[PDB]
Amino acid sequence: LKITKVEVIPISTPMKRIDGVLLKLHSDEGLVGIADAGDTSSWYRGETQDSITSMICDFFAPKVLLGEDPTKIEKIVGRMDILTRDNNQAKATVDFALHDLVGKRFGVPVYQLLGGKTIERIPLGLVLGAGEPEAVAEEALAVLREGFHFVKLKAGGPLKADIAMVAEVRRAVGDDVDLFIDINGAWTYDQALTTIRALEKYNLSKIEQPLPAWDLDGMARLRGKVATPIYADESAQELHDLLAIINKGAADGLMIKTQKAGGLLKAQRWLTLARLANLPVICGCMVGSGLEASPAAHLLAANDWIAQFPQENAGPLHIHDCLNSRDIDNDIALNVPRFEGGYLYPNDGPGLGIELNEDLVRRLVTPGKAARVVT
Amino acid sequence: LKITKVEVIPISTPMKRIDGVLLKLHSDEGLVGIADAGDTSSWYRGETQDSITSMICDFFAPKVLLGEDPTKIEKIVGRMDILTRDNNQAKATVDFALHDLVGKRFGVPVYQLLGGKTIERIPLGLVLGAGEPEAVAEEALAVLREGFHFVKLKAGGPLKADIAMVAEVRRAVGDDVDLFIDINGAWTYDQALTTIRALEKYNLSKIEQPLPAWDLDGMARLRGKVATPIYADESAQELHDLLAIINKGAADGLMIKTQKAGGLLKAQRWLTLARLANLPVICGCMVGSGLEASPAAHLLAANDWIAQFPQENAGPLHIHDCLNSRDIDNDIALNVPRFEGGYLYPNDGPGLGIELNEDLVRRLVTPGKAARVVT
Amino acid sequence: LKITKVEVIPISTPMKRIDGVLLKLHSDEGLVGIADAGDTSSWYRGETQDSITSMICDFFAPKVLLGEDPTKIEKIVGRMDILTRDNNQAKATVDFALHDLVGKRFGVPVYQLLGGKTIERIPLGLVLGAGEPEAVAEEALAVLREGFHFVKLKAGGPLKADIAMVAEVRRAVGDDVDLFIDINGAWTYDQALTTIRALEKYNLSKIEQPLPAWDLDGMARLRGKVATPIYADESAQELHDLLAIINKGAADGLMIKTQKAGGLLKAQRWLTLARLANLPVICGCMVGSGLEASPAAHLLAANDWIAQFPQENAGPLHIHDCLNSRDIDNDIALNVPRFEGGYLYPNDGPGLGIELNEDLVRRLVTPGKAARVVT
Amino acid sequence: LKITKVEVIPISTPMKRIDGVLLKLHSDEGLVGIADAGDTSSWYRGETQDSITSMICDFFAPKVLLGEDPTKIEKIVGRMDILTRDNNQAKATVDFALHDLVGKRFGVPVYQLLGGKTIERIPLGLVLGAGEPEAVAEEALAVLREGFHFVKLKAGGPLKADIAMVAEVRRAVGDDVDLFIDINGAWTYDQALTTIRALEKYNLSKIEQPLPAWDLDGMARLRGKVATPIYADESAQELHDLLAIINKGAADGLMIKTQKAGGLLKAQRWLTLARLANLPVICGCMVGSGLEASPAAHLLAANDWIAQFPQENAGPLHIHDCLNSRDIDNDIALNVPRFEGGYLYPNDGPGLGIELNEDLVRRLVTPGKAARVVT
Ligand SMILES: [Ba+2]
Ligand SMILES: [Ba+2]
Ligand SMILES: [Ba+2]
Ligand SMILES: [Ba+2]
């Protein structure tokens, strides 16, 4: 009923390291809302363990959270946006914890707070790791054999390397497989035009964010010079970005991340615009534990618009480098959401439905750092 | 955990008559979700007791509701939209009942399902009834005396009559009172320009929907030839309408109605667009009982964006011809939400927080009609 | 010379059921104007037997029709539009009966009131019934043998099924046949782009309404990614919709339905915009009797613009499961308009030129329902 | 049933001379459709007695009219448009006679073919003749005394002269009188800006076509620099002109002339665009007899859109230089439409309801010219 303690724990996870943060919102009635920010990326989000910890502990905690009723999510989300510019991941982390606390308080899974369980399970697609073309092709076949619905490749370059990678993978998987690449906005306009055209013979279902996030005119110009659908990820962050994207005709589809959107509530608003745009939405993740994947799992199962498309919320599979969750027993979440046969099933327990492995969390606290508590 | 019976009751409520419909969604575990569609308007909404009854009983009931889990609001709202074009009021009614049922099932007020109680009370303004200018001016003073925050006049015409009314009211109340008029989209472009300019000396705060709902280009042209702010009501119904409004610059403010939007969930999406447009929003009502006013009361108290502006959700005051709810003793709602000092307070009981006077409901069933039940 | 009673009859006609309504406008001089609303579609139009019956009987009858001169069509159509939002089908029905009454009064066929008999007969195309690809291809060949001018397929999905259907039909009919599909606005942007490109090898003449009625920006964006012409049906309802379509370049062609347009008079206005846009127009129907097909038959033979293109007004052929009218003898219309050799011939008698089988009409009254009369 | 003879009579009517043409479409069953093209204007329309006579007799007659069924108005109008560019007044004349013949054949007034009699009478406004401002002011007072609804002035020039005229008239008539001026597209952009601003102190209800017909950019630019509403006349001729006007926001209102539009059918289409634009429309005339006034009289009483505004169809009052029609005995129409108390009443006889004064017609044949007949 009242938040009385805000605790931020800096953790580092090895994968085969991921620097993230865990948040605990203690209430005056025993219940504790928890959340995992997921990995931190200087280029994709621009937030770090320390920026997230300071913004939550030095600002959100004393100015918005302490003494507040956690059920007032619209209110808190609004106050955080007024108080702070950007810091989407920090805000998202708090939002996740609030929903967890509220769900625990009302005795219901978070998807019940997000509109109900629209679908029982979420079909998933997966991104492959870097490697030699022959190796990436082998990993692709393994992903498909497991049941995944699409294969996504990262395009580091040079051109010769990207072409070789795509050609080998397409050769192995066949022409019926949904195969696309992600550029992370690394190309100049000319690079994009040249490379996308050189790849046309491989029939990729789409090209994800080929140009910089801010180059909306470029994305629109590109779409008028190439056949391959162009999806926006980094470009589609805020509500006004989405408006600009539809107005400039800068995309054929969209990617979302709960941390990019700024939280579950902000994600719902984000999805309202995607719906208005009548565009497909694929949700990814900020590589993290079973707790990091939970907010999205609940959202992807509840949101009617996003419930229409295959997803990419598979942080745990990336950290534990495997294709399903039965092959995972040392995650900070004792009960990692179920990943099976290419599908994600959201947990059904109260709140986010995650029980933390407290001893592992203690063992994974970032060397040289410590948890911070605010009351 | 399942809806087993859909009941629609046609009622006629005398003023000081309002033809509407009540909805009852019976679950297999005793709980019943209730809702009041409110008044029906052929020109404002285009729906009637009969259209709502048939769309709910002949379509939504067998195809979407019966046998479904009422907590799956996102899912149900989506299916109703795919199944049926328009019929926003019928859809809203179902949405209202669902939220009421879910709230009762979870033991929480609907505002908790809409993001929490952002504000404890809602400042209200009121629309005055037709009459001689002197009489209208007197009701205005009575309204302000009670604490209400603004006075809205309905402009019926002709020109000389509209000027007389506004002139008398402005004289009576003073220059520091928020006064504005509603045209309900009755003017041709020229009439608008002429009248608005003729009224300028009275410094109205705004003109509500001067042109037809579909004339967005005209609304934009108008804002180019007059000083007075132009607000859209009938023009702002669907999500794509709001997009068009912001793209064309067809409005300085917006009017919403839960029945127009299509339900609470649809209204939340509607308000996401209002937020993006950074425009004020004033919620009205389809003149009804305390039950009709409840969904809006919950939304107006929860939604962060709309919690910033004074509202106009006061149907019970109009039916019972009073300025505060202590003076209401014969409403279908045994516990009419509190209307006091110009403020609206949402009930805090589970669901919509309304207890029906089953005896009065039976007495108000529209003559010649009967309740309909579907299993 | 004066409407003295409005009668609405709810009927259900079995296939080889269709729920519609019949309208009778009795005059004080013996003449009676009749009309058939045709089938009712929750998703396509949003009107039902009850909604139409109530708007006509509870609103149009006492407020606009009773005591009025039926020849004042411009006036009545205007008042109906001021009085009621949407309800296009109900309005259309009244318009049809008025034209029938005025025609009977002047002793002339309705086409004379619509500008004269521009063409003698109307070339037709036909939509095929659902079924296995092989079965649909067989029906397609039967259709072409009778003389029909094009074959339209309803695309339901999933992708593989649509491709299978189209592939098989094209194989059987050959490359010289005009073949196209109708999506009824069921696709999201990506689905459309994907499926449309996947079907290019079958050279469809066009894709009818691939995206939602409201997604004009999507329709335009789509036209920028595919070669196949894109036609609008659901998107082209009101005059302002048509304006938006020409301004946005959202279509290569249009489809109309008298019931969608809102009546014969509004259909002429609709066609004035089609002319200005210099776009082809194919008129469909709300599947019904010879009476339902008559208003459209008169319009398609009279309107100079629409008389340039093949049409799809063949409700009686669908109800009675045949390819020509000589094979019909149990329709509510004793004299069903001539459907022969792939052409539709408007009747030449006064008004709509239809004489009802009163006995069958009484036999088809919807079980549990009853005709309504207002004086 | 069939047109067997086309007759065109060149006439010159002195005023208080006007060069026009009369048309007679003879049928094989005795009935004859008649029409008066009205005055000819080289600058406003660009057609003459000779151009009209030749286009009708040398082209329309042999290629479209002779041997055709006059009831096929949509067809005939379409064929004339395909066969001939421009020549709107000639096409209009033929259209007028067709409606007259059809009305005569069916035994109904033309307004019955145009949608019925929406209004009983047409409120009128009047344009004043040139002269000294004192003289113009007296004429204005007499006009208002008769009951006319507005006063229109012609802007001759230079600026000093226009100011004096407007100031004097405005002084004599009062502030509550609808007063405006017509420039006939005679100004360059700078002239308009200057004169309109110099006239702002007189509160003219609008400025009619201040810039050239083709200068739509200028009309839009002008509205961006002055408060006075700008109406389009010469700029609003064809359907595509109307579209360009609404897209560019070049007008606050519109003026129409049946001869400019190209006939009654083309006028109805013209008015459909006016309706879509939600703009007022004032119909003028090409100074002529009671026969020239008849087509418009029927149209202004029938068309629902134009029946909303005061009109300026008063040819006979100009030719006979009077304020009502009781004082008219020597017009080529024996029964001039009733012009009384500032209102115009359409005739109720078959067709256009006009009987020609054959003796006067022969007396008015243009000196040196003769009637032309084609079979
Ligand atoms: Ba990316
Ligand atoms: Ba309103
Ligand atoms: Ba369709
Ligand atoms: Ba002029």
Short mmCIF file of C-alpha atoms in Angstrom, two decimals, chain B residues 175-345:
data_model
loop_
_atom_site.label_atom_id
_atom_site.label_comp_id
_atom_site.label_asym_id
_atom_site.label_seq_id
_atom_site.Cartn_x
_atom_site.Cartn_y
_atom_site.Cartn_z
CA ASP B 175 -15.76 38.57 -17.39
CA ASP B 176 -13.66 36.19 -15.27
CA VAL B 177 -15.93 33.17 -15.78
CA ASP B 178 -14.99 30.35 -18.16
CA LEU B 179 -17.86 30.46 -20.64
CA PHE B 180 -18.14 28.70 -24.00
CA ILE B 181 -20.63 27.38 -26.54
CA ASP B 182 -21.39 24.08 -28.27
CA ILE B 183 -22.68 24.01 -31.85
CA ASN B 184 -22.90 20.23 -32.31
CA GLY B 185 -21.58 20.60 -35.87
CA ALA B 186 -24.63 22.47 -37.14
CA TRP B 187 -22.95 25.27 -39.12
CA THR B 188 -21.90 25.71 -42.71
CA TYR B 189 -18.48 27.33 -43.08
CA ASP B 190 -19.79 30.87 -43.70
CA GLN B 191 -22.27 30.75 -40.80
CA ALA B 192 -19.40 29.77 -38.49
CA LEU B 193 -17.07 32.58 -39.54
CA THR B 194 -19.88 35.13 -39.22
CA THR B 195 -21.21 34.03 -35.83
CA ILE B 196 -17.86 33.39 -34.17
CA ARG B 197 -16.68 36.85 -35.19
CA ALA B 198 -19.98 38.33 -34.04
CA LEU B 199 -19.46 36.70 -30.62
CA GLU B 200 -15.82 37.74 -30.21
CA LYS B 201 -16.70 40.72 -28.00
CA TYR B 202 -18.00 38.28 -25.39
CA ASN B 203 -14.60 36.55 -25.20
CA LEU B 204 -15.84 32.95 -25.12
CA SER B 205 -13.07 30.53 -24.08
CA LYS B 206 -13.78 28.35 -27.12
CA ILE B 207 -16.29 27.15 -29.70
CA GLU B 208 -17.14 23.45 -29.51
CA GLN B 209 -17.51 21.71 -32.90
CA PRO B 210 -18.84 24.59 -35.07
CA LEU B 211 -18.71 22.53 -38.29
CA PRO B 212 -19.84 19.00 -39.27
CA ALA B 213 -17.79 16.12 -37.85
CA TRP B 214 -16.30 15.24 -41.24
CA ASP B 215 -15.31 18.79 -42.23
CA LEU B 216 -11.77 18.75 -40.81
CA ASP B 217 -10.40 20.93 -43.60
CA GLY B 218 -13.13 23.43 -42.80
CA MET B 219 -12.26 23.29 -39.11
CA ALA B 220 -8.64 24.04 -40.05
CA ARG B 221 -9.71 26.86 -42.41
CA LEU B 222 -11.89 28.29 -39.64
CA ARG B 223 -9.02 28.42 -37.16
CA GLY B 224 -7.34 30.50 -39.85
CA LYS B 225 -10.03 33.17 -39.97
CA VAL B 226 -11.02 33.46 -36.28
CA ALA B 227 -9.26 34.12 -32.98
CA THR B 228 -11.45 32.03 -30.66
CA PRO B 229 -10.12 28.52 -29.89
CA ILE B 230 -11.88 25.73 -31.79
CA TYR B 231 -12.51 22.39 -30.07
CA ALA B 232 -13.55 19.13 -31.70
CA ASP B 233 -16.10 16.68 -30.30
CA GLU B 234 -18.00 14.86 -33.04
CA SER B 235 -14.91 15.10 -35.26
CA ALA B 236 -12.82 13.25 -32.64
CA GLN B 237 -14.38 9.79 -32.50
CA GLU B 238 -11.89 7.20 -33.75
CA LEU B 239 -8.11 6.92 -33.47
CA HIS B 240 -7.61 7.80 -37.14
CA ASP B 241 -9.85 10.85 -36.65
CA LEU B 242 -7.50 12.21 -33.98
CA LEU B 243 -4.52 11.57 -36.27
CA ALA B 244 -6.23 13.53 -39.03
CA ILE B 245 -7.06 16.32 -36.59
CA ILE B 246 -3.45 16.76 -35.47
CA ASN B 247 -2.14 16.44 -39.04
CA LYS B 248 -4.53 19.07 -40.40
CA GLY B 249 -4.43 21.32 -37.34
CA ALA B 250 -8.21 21.12 -37.07
CA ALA B 251 -8.50 21.80 -33.34
CA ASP B 252 -7.18 23.64 -30.27
CA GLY B 253 -8.84 21.18 -27.87
CA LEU B 254 -10.83 17.95 -27.65
CA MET B 255 -14.09 16.55 -26.22
CA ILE B 256 -14.46 12.85 -25.37
CA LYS B 257 -17.30 10.54 -24.32
CA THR B 258 -16.71 6.97 -23.21
CA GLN B 259 -19.65 5.88 -25.38
CA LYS B 260 -18.24 7.73 -28.40
CA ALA B 261 -14.75 6.30 -27.90
CA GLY B 262 -16.24 2.81 -27.66
CA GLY B 263 -15.41 1.87 -24.08
CA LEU B 264 -12.87 2.46 -21.31
CA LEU B 265 -10.04 0.58 -23.06
CA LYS B 266 -10.76 2.36 -26.36
CA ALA B 267 -10.94 5.65 -24.44
CA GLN B 268 -7.47 5.00 -22.99
CA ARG B 269 -6.09 4.56 -26.50
CA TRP B 270 -8.04 7.68 -27.50
CA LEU B 271 -6.37 9.60 -24.67
CA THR B 272 -2.95 8.33 -25.79
CA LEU B 273 -3.49 10.26 -29.02
CA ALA B 274 -4.76 13.32 -27.12
CA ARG B 275 -1.53 13.21 -25.11
CA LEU B 276 0.56 12.98 -28.28
CA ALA B 277 -1.30 16.01 -29.62
CA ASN B 278 -0.69 17.82 -26.31
CA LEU B 279 -4.32 18.97 -26.35
CA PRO B 280 -6.79 19.43 -23.46
CA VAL B 281 -9.64 16.92 -23.16
CA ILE B 282 -13.08 17.47 -21.63
CA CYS B 283 -15.23 14.38 -21.08
CA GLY B 284 -18.99 14.60 -21.43
CA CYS B 285 -21.71 12.01 -21.01
CA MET B 286 -24.76 10.44 -22.61
CA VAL B 287 -27.14 11.79 -19.94
CA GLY B 288 -27.72 8.87 -17.59
CA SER B 289 -27.94 7.41 -14.08
CA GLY B 290 -25.21 7.10 -11.48
CA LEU B 291 -24.25 3.88 -13.23
CA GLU B 292 -23.84 5.71 -16.55
CA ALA B 293 -21.54 8.24 -14.88
CA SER B 294 -19.36 5.63 -13.13
CA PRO B 295 -17.16 4.34 -15.97
CA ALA B 296 -16.20 7.94 -16.80
CA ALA B 297 -15.73 8.82 -13.13
CA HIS B 298 -13.21 5.98 -12.84
CA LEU B 299 -11.43 6.97 -16.06
CA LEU B 300 -11.32 10.69 -15.23
CA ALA B 301 -9.73 9.90 -11.86
CA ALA B 302 -7.21 7.38 -13.19
CA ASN B 303 -5.98 8.55 -16.60
CA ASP B 304 -2.94 10.81 -16.13
CA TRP B 305 -3.61 12.90 -19.22
CA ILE B 306 -7.28 13.70 -18.67
CA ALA B 307 -6.69 14.25 -14.93
CA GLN B 308 -5.27 17.65 -15.93
CA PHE B 309 -8.51 19.26 -17.08
CA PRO B 310 -11.95 20.13 -15.68
CA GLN B 311 -14.67 17.75 -16.89
CA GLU B 312 -18.33 17.51 -17.80
CA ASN B 313 -19.46 14.03 -16.69
CA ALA B 314 -22.66 14.87 -14.77
CA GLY B 315 -25.62 13.00 -16.23
CA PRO B 316 -27.31 12.29 -12.86
CA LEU B 317 -27.46 16.01 -12.09
CA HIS B 318 -29.31 16.60 -15.35
CA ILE B 319 -31.79 13.76 -14.82
CA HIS B 320 -32.59 14.71 -11.23
CA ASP B 321 -32.46 18.43 -11.96
CA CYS B 322 -30.07 19.26 -9.10
CA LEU B 323 -26.55 20.61 -8.62
CA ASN B 324 -25.23 18.07 -6.11
CA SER B 325 -25.97 14.41 -5.42
CA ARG B 326 -27.19 14.70 -1.83
CA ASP B 327 -30.42 15.84 -3.47
CA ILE B 328 -30.85 12.59 -5.43
CA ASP B 329 -32.90 9.79 -3.85
CA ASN B 330 -34.60 8.01 -6.76
CA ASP B 331 -31.80 6.88 -9.14
CA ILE B 332 -31.35 3.31 -10.38
CA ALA B 333 -28.05 3.54 -8.54
CA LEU B 334 -28.70 3.23 -4.82
CA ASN B 335 -25.32 4.89 -4.28
CA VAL B 336 -24.92 7.65 -6.86
CA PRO B 337 -21.32 8.86 -7.11
CA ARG B 338 -20.77 12.00 -5.04
CA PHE B 339 -21.24 15.29 -6.91
CA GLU B 340 -20.37 18.07 -4.47
CA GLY B 341 -18.96 21.59 -4.55
CA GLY B 342 -18.52 21.34 -8.30
CA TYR B 343 -16.51 18.13 -7.99
CA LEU B 344 -17.10 14.49 -8.86
CA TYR B 345 -15.77 11.75 -6.59
#
